[PDB]
Amino acid sequence: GNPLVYLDVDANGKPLGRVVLELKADVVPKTAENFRALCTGEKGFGYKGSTFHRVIPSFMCQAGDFTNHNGTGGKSIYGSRFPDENFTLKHVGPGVLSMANAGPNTNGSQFFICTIKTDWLDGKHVVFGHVIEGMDVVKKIESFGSKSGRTSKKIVITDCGQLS
Ligand SMILES: CCOC(=O)CNC(=O)NCc1ccc(N)cc1
């Protein structure tokens, strides 16, 4: 069935725990496959060691820039960018997993986890999963953000991979 992957997150070098994500390959197979392989690191690159660089309370936690480490970069397993697969899944509430972008068809590796319903992103960002477990970790991460998105703690994905 749909892959389960994990992110183990530190904040200032102390572990916050594990966020488990279901990737909705049944709806968005290409987008799910990208995220899955970036979690495993099996192409030679991926999320391990990268940061949550932009976190805005009552909105979302954003991460996945493992090339520039600042929110300008990242890349997919297919190349630097790939198309919007579809917008079938909606930003229905907290725990929704969705691709960051710089406009249409600029998906790379950056992603975000919503902490509220972000319905205005519907049709602009590809939703491809949700938090199965570890929403408590997502709320801790959210607590270290700011209105500008600037984090008050160093939030690092120390480990990641595929559970099934
Ligand atoms: C709620 C999500 O809000 C954003 O996505 C704001 N945009 C954003 O950070 N853009 C920088 C960026 C550059 C390259 C790729 N591949 C993805 C993102």
Swiss-Prot record:
Cell location: Mitochondrion matrix
Residue numbers of N6-acetyllysine PTMs: 24, 124
Sequence positions bearing S-nitrosocysteine: 160
Catalyzed reactions: [protein]-peptidylproline (omega=180) = [protein]-peptidylproline (omega=0)
Keyword annotations from UniProtKB, A to Z: Acetylation, Apoptosis, Isomerase, Mitochondrion, Necrosis, Rotamase, S-nitrosylation, Transit peptide
Post-translational modification comment from the UniProt entry: Acetylated at Lys-124; deacetylated at Lys-124 by SIRT3.
GO molecular function, one term: peptidyl-prolyl cis-trans isomerase activity
EC number(s) stated in the UniProt entry for this protein: 5.2.1.8
Keyword Isomerase attached: yes
Modified sites of kind N6-succinyllysine: 24, 43, 132, 147
Regulation of activity: Inhibited by cyclosporin A (CsA). Is displaced by CsA from the mPTP leading to a lower open probability of the mPTP.
GO biological-process terms attached to the record: apoptotic mitochondrial changes; cellular response to arsenic-containing substance; cellular response to calcium ion; cellular response to hydrogen peroxide; mitochondrial depolarization; mitochondrial outer membrane permeabilization involved in programmed cell death; necroptotic process; negative regulation of apoptotic process
GO cellular component: cytoplasm; membrane; mitochondrial matrix; mitochondrial permeability transition pore complex; mitochondrion
Domain PPIase cyclophilin-type: 6-162
Assembly mode: Associates with the mitochondrial membrane ATP synthase F(1)F(0) ATP synthase; the association is increased by inorganic phosphate (Pi) and decreased by cyclosporin A (CsA). Interacts with ATP5F1B; ATP5PD and ATP5PO. Interacts with SLC25A3; the interaction is impaired by CsA. Interacts with BCL2; the interaction is impaired by CsA. Interacts with TP53; the association implicates preferentially tetrameric TP53, is induced by oxidative stress and is impaired by CsA. Interacts with C1QBP. Interacts with MCUR1.
Family according to the record: Belongs to the cyclophilin-type PPIase family.
Biological role: PPIase that catalyzes the cis-trans isomerization of proline imidic peptide bonds in oligopeptides and may therefore assist protein folding. Involved in regulation of the mitochondrial permeability transition pore (mPTP). It is proposed that its association with the mPTP is masking a binding site for inhibiting inorganic phosphate (Pi) and promotes the open probability of the mPTP leading to apoptosis or necrosis; the requirement of the PPIase activity for this function is debated. In cooperation with mitochondrial p53/TP53 is involved in activating oxidative stress-induced necrosis.
This protein's name: Peptidyl-prolyl cis-trans isomerase F, mitochondrial
Organism from which the protein derives: Homo sapiens (Human)
Gene name linked to the record: PPIF
Residues of the full protein shown: 44 to 207 of 207
